[PDB]
Design a protein around this ligand. Structure first.
Ligand code: TC8
Ligand code: MG
Ligand code: ZN
Length: 318
């Protein structure tokens, strides 16, 4: 019964108002696997790369279960959402008309795994608590590097692409890594500035692999923080979950005298002030530039929701 209603939702998987929460409820927490598997079929990746469907399900399942379902925000549901948003961007004219099956393949996988095995606390927390991951990656894109090497781990263990040449598997790993590392919010000014320069010069050539992947990296960055770009009802749920996770890190910091990180203090920081600032300083600048690149209706819609949703947070004050 429930698994019959899920199929129908996937018919509108390219819709910006797709309800990922419902989809995950109907599938019993199998949204990432169910949605990503469908996208592989939909983009014809199974045939294109002679994929063993048994190996594909195993791989997708290893990914989904490697997410901590206990994190209120960084879990497989969040991954599924980013993956779904990525799919809508790939449908945009300028990308649809230049990406190769291979690009779509790396895009979807990178989206599905960009927060793999996320611990639920940020980088500065891992650094000041001397977490081995911070040591391993020399306090640089600690989380993103961890998500990527984990992805490379599941890629190898699944043997999904064992029939492809080594060189190809290695490139797949390198390009997925470049896509995942671009999601390190900490380095957005560098990524946004570069993108902006190119949009000003108007020199981007989409038939060039490098330029095309810079764009794909910006699309992944968008997908990762497009929560405020969704309809209020969806955006509201994400705002509460990300804030809940932030506050939990804060409670731990307070309890163990580690110093309460910014945005993580439930006593001195409002969920509204957090969302407003986030939308004003990180979401809006990014999507404006993206709108300069992909000047379509989806871009207007997305910036539109950010406008409405933000006012609603201000409204929810005084
Ligand atoms: C809602 S996610 C988020 N909110 C912020 C609010 C103020 C300052 C910084 C952030 C921020 O870095 N994030 C964020 C992100 F944009 C991407 C990944 C994780 C995050 F915590
Ligand atoms: Mg991340
Ligand atoms: Zn993310």
């Amino acid at each position: 019964d429930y698994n019959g209603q899920a199929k129908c939702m996937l018919e509108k998987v390219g819709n910006w108002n797709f309800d990922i929460f419902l989809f995950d409820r109907l599938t019993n927490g199998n949204s990432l696997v169910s949605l990503t598997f469908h996208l592989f079929s939909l983009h014809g990746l199974i045939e294109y790369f002679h994929l063993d469907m048994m190996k594909l399900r195993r791989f997708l399942v290893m990914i989904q279960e490697d997410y901590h379902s206990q994190n209120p925000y960084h879990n497989a549901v969040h991954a599924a959402d980013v993956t779904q948003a990525m799919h809508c961007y790939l449908k945009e004219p300028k990308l649809a008309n230049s990406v190769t099956p291979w690009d779509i393949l790396l895009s979807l996988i990178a989206a599905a795994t960009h927060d793999l095995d996320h611990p639920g606390v940020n980088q500065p927390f891992l650094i000041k608590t001397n977490h081995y991951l911070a040591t391993l990656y020399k306090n640089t894109s600690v989380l993103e590097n961890h998500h990527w090497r984990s992805a490379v781990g599941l890629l190898r263990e699944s043997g999904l692409f064992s029939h492809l040449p080594l060189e190809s598997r290695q490139q797949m790993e390198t390009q997925i890594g470049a896509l995942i590392l671009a999601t390190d919010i900490s380095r957005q000014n560098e990524y946004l500035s570069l993108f902006r320069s190119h949009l000003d010069r108007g020199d981007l050539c989409l038939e060039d692999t490098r330029h095309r992947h810079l764009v794909l990296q910006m699309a992944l960055k968008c997908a990762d923080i497009c929560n405020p770009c969704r309809t209020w009802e969806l955006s509201k749920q994400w705002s509460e979950k990300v804030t809940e996770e932030f506050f939990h890190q804060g409670d731990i910091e307070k309890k163990y005298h580690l110093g309460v990180s910014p945005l993580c203090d439930r006593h001195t920081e409002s969920i509204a002030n957090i969302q407003i600032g986030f939308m004003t300083y990180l979401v809006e600048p990014l999507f404006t530039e993206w709108a300069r690149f992909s000047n379509t209706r989806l871009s207007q819609t997305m910036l539109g929701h950010v406008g409405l949703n933000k006012a609603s947070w201000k409204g929810l004050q005084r």
